[PDB]
Amino acid sequence: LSETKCTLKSFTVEKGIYQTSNFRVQPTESIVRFPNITNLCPFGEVFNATRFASVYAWNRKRISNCVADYSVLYNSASFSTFKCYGVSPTKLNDLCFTNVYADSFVIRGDWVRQIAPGQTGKIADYNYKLPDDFTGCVIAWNSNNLDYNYLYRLFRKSNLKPFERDISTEIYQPLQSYYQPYRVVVLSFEAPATVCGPKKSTNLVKNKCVNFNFNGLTGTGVLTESNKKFLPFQQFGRDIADTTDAVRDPQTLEILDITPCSFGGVSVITPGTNTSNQVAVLYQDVNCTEVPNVFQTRAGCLIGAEHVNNSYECDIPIGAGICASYQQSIIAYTMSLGAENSVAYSNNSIAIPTNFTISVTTEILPVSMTKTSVD
Amino acid sequence: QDSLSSTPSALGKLQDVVNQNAQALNTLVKQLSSNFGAISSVLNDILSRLDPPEAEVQIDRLITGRLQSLQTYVTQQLIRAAEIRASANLAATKMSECVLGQSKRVDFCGKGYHLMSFPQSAPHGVVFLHVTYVPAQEKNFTTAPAICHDGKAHFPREGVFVSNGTHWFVTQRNFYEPQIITTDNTFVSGNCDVVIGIVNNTVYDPLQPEL
Amino acid sequence: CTMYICGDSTECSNLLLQYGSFCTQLNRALTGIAVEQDKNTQEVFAQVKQIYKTPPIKDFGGFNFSQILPDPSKPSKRSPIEDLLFNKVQKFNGLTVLPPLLTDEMIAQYTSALLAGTITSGWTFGAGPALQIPFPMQMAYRFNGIGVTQNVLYENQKLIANQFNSAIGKIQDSLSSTPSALGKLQDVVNQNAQALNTLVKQLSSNFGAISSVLNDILSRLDPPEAEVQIDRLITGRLQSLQTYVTQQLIRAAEIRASANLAATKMSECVLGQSKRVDFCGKGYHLMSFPQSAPHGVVFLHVTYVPAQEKNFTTAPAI
Ligand SMILES: *[C@@H]1O[C@H](CO)[C@@H](O[C@@H]2O[C@H](CO)[C@@H](O)[C@H](O)[C@H]2NC(C)=O)[C@H](O)[C@H]1NC(C)=O
Ligand SMILES: *[C@@H]1O[C@H](CO)[C@@H](O[C@@H]2O[C@H](CO)[C@@H](O)[C@H](O)[C@H]2NC(C)=O)[C@H](O)[C@H]1NC(C)=O
Ligand SMILES: *[C@@H]1O[C@H](CO)[C@@H](O)[C@H](O)[C@H]1NC(C)=O
Ligand SMILES: *[C@@H]1O[C@H](CO)[C@@H](O)[C@H](O)[C@H]1NC(C)=O
Ligand SMILES: *[C@@H]1O[C@H](CO)[C@@H](O)[C@H](O)[C@H]1NC(C)=O
Ligand SMILES: *[C@@H]1O[C@H](CO)[C@@H](O)[C@H](O)[C@H]1NC(C)=O
Ligand SMILES: *[C@@H]1O[C@H](CO)[C@@H](O)[C@H](O)[C@H]1NC(C)=O
Ligand SMILES: *[C@@H]1O[C@H](CO)[C@@H](O)[C@H](O)[C@H]1NC(C)=O
Ligand SMILES: *[C@@H]1O[C@H](CO)[C@@H](O)[C@H](O)[C@H]1NC(C)=O
Ligand SMILES: *[C@@H]1O[C@H](CO)[C@@H](O)[C@H](O)[C@H]1NC(C)=O
Ligand SMILES: *[C@@H]1O[C@H](CO)[C@@H](O)[C@H](O)[C@H]1NC(C)=O
Ligand SMILES: *[C@@H]1O[C@H](CO)[C@@H](O)[C@H](O)[C@H]1NC(C)=O
DSSP states (O other): OOHHHHHTSSOOOSSSEEEEEEEEOOOOOOOEOOOOOOSSSOOHHHHHOOOBGGGGGOOOEEOOOOEOHHHHHHSSOOOOOEEEESSTTSSGOEEESSOOEEEEEEEEGGGGGSSBTTSSSSSHHHOOOBBOOOOEEEEEEOTTTTOOOOOOEESSSOOTTOOOOOOOOOOOOOOOOOEEEEEEEEEEEEOOOOOEOOOOOOOOOOOOOOEEEEEEEEEEEEEEEOOOOOOOOEEEEEEETTEEEEOTTTOOOOOOEEEEEOOEEEEEEEOOOOOOOOOOEEEETOOOOTTOEEOOOOOOEEEEEEEEEEOOSSSSEEEEEEEEEEEEEEEEOOOOOOOOOEEOOOTTTEEEEEEEEEEEHHHHHHHHOOOOOOO | HHHHHHOOOGHHHHHHHHHHEEEEEHHHHGGGGGGGGGGOOOOOHHHHHHHHHHHHHHHHHHHHHHHOOOOOOOOHHHHHHHHHHHHHHHHHIIIIIISSSSOOOBEEEESEEEEEEEEEEEEEEEEEEEEEEEEEEEEEEEESOEEEEEEEEEEEESSEEEEEESSSSEEOTTTTOBOOOOTTTTTEEEESSSTTTTTOOOOOOTTTTOO | OOOHHHHTTHHHHHGGGGGTTHHHHHHHHHHHHHHHHHHHHHHHOOSSSSEEEEEEOOOOSOOOOOOSSSSSSSSSSSHHHHHHHHHHHOGTTTTTOOOSSSSSSHHHHOOOOOOOOHHHHHHGGGGGSOOOOHHHHHHHHHTTTTTTOOHHTTTTTHHEEEEEEEHHHHHHHHHOGGGGGHHHHHHOOOOOOOOHHHHHHOOOOOOOOOOOOOHHHHHHHOOHHHHHHHHHHHHHHHHHHHHHHHHHHHHHHHHHHHHHHHHHIIIIIISSOSSBBBBBBSSSEEEEEEEEEETEEEEEEEEEOSSSSSOOOOSSSO
């Protein structure tokens, strides 16, 4: 009742039914499922390499079939730059990727700023370009306490496409030798997952409301066995709102259906607060066994009203033929459409008025509205 | 007068219009407290702190939000205005057909048979008092479609033939007023063989008793 | 509103609050429409003070009403014609549907009462108490009401009853042969279904964001970046919902106007005899019978149509 009062911004409530809130079942536990992968990803093969390629001819290492722990680099104290785009550097271990690509090259300190999406310049345009829709992390460090003639492209007919590597040496109507040396590794983040961060798995739980993470896919809902005929390559299905309604368990290859946890509107049935502070609550389209004088109707689960067999004129409508009233306590009943009357019809019988009455009735109609004006 | 004085909800139709518009205006004003992503809902507080290249960004958010709020208000008023116009047109029709005449339209000017109406002025509207005739205290009579007399079928000119159990009379339909069946209140069409349920009675010719 | 836009995301919900009362206004507008829909139904069908019943013996002088009266051997007490009319004609994104206050059975009961009333007491029950009259006599009064003398009815009673009975039989056969007959009711159903599907599909749009899915944004970005992407989705989703509600208010107004016309016809065509040309069908109106239909009403209008005219010489006076 207090909820109704706050909803209506008043300390009094008139007779009627009001929607004040929403019922929702909360999750009990978190179900985490990742592919069973044992070996660690060869990031070190790129980062602790004896030699890095020139910027005009950068190298690419493909990372696949492995566990990608990025906290070793993030916390590693050695870098001058650790800038992530589209992802966060401290959340990378909770992500799964189709592929991870580690690009590596040598640059001068004054180009460090060019290793980014949305950039222009001699490196950004002729040697190493990132797309504006870039997802990945750029990691760079000062390597002048470690280390020769490295080249960059100075002349070209046109600019490079994202991730293009032009290593030709035609004459321009192109390369020049390289203020501290920097080593740069760019981790580009790209189906079933192939590369996942350390995240331990839990047991699969079904027929309960749970939080979940399936191979990087997150959401809340009830998991049940699916009868969907997934093809051997399909991992998940999608609805018209582009939501996930089924997944393939990454360890058991079991197809699970996802049904969002029960919820529905909550409305309060009340006589005016001038008469009584008793209320009844209707859980719209909710089953009374899910909600925890309990009357299940088509409108929803009505709790607090006593159902009776006597039919009365409708007072506060519930829906589907059911009305409620205060008679004291709150009751629920099927509404009457009026008293019955059998007319004494016969092929030779007529009824004729022998008297009459003069009646006066009232009809009220709106004619006009306040003439507001807003500057 | 006694009925209206005892029922606060009687004018709910007029009060609803007042309440809906008042609610719409209060909603519009309250939206001025929303920042819509800005550092502040108040333009003066933005301007006293930020320089133009930064101030304009914060102002842009408030303009977008406030313009959207005002557009929502106006759209709702146009829709509501259309409903009021339809009501006013109905009220004008009732004035012409219920007050300036007598209507034959069922339930157009209230329940019962319309006699007349009287308008009364009301805040933002009109109230009609409809005066109607309602039949009362009906009685069971035996009837027939026609009377058979001297080989001819007699039908009522205006009323209906009724019997009180021993005698036949002709009466007006909406008020019992039995009269002797005569040649002046019936007409003849065809013989007594065609009509289903025809009964034998005497039709009085008001000539021979004097001639 | 809140669920449609933000689902169960806390970060989105807190940003949505920065827009003030827009969700309150939208939820309120839809509530107002839902209430109107029960009002519309009540105004059309609940025009009878008492629930009238027909007699056990259907003797109406040759007039057969079995196709418009309820069929007692059916779960639904619907008439043969109503049964035909009825046979012929999101949830997890915050979009639900509320049931009508008056169920189909209850509406059928109102219709039955109106039919029993007009068959046994003519128009009297619509003005005051129901006064019984023999059906053939009621029809004779309706003939006088169109400028035809009452003996025309009585001298042709078998012919008139036969033409009436035939015409009713042809209504059922006509409806069963023409799928488009109920297009007026189907159009309402199709327009609202289309509007809801459009609203749901908009949840697949990113509106400039990196993703259409809030969970995918939140699992990747930290608040200072995540909020930017969420802001774009809120703006787009709020705009999509506002568009939906505006269209429903306009459509609701059209339905209200139709319901008001239907209620007027119930009063003037069913509870009386109309003198308004083409208000209760072509020809001279005699009487009408309502039938219940999904989300609407069907009127069967019985009219007198002149036939087989002949050329005569005339004069204004003798
Ligand atoms: C009233 O009309 C119905 C038809 O609408 C009559 O019922 C039909 O009777 C014929 C035989 O003459 C049967 O072949 C049909 O199958 C029946 N149809 C239905 C739906 O029952 C009914 O007999 C008529 N009643 C009266 C008193 O004449
Ligand atoms: C008025 O029209 C009706 C309807 O056409 C005529 O009734 C038909 O007459 C033919 C010929 O005898 C019969 O075969 C049909 O079965 C009758 N129809 C019905 C429904 O009974 C009627 O005879 C015409 N009357 C006049 C004076 O022309
Ligand atoms: C490279 O080796 C250094 C020094 O042992 C270590 O600090 C760093 O984590 C290593 N990085 C990679 C990518 O293996
Ligand atoms: C991986 O998990 C699946 C599903 O639980 C199980 O069937 C399989 O034996 C596991 N394989 C390894 C290598 O652990
Ligand atoms: C509350 O109920 C009493 C008793 O019927 C009545 O006199 C009083 O006016 C009511 N007050 C309000 C605000 O309705
Ligand atoms: C509620 O759930 C029970 C199963 O526990 C089921 O039998 C019943 O039909 C359901 N009722 C509704 C309205 O869904
Ligand atoms: C209503 O009637 C049913 C029998 O149809 C009975 O089982 C039920 O207990 C009754 N309820 C009340 C409140 O009388
Ligand atoms: C007419 O007679 C019937 C009995 O057949 C009775 O029920 C009805 O009330 C009577 N009507 C009047 C007006 O007396
Ligand atoms: C019918 O009316 C006549 C004339 O007033 C009267 O004499 C007769 O007794 C009445 N019959 C009955 C059954 O009331
Ligand atoms: C009225 O019905 C009776 C049977 O109860 C019958 O004998 C009589 O002829 C019928 N009268 C008319 C006018 O149909
Ligand atoms: C009326 O009287 C005649 C005799 O003149 C008789 O043949 C006929 O059947 C009677 N009709 C009725 C309805 O009593
Ligand atoms: C009346 O006569 C005209 C010829 O002047 C003819 O065309 C028309 O069809 C006739 N109408 C009738 C009802 O016979």
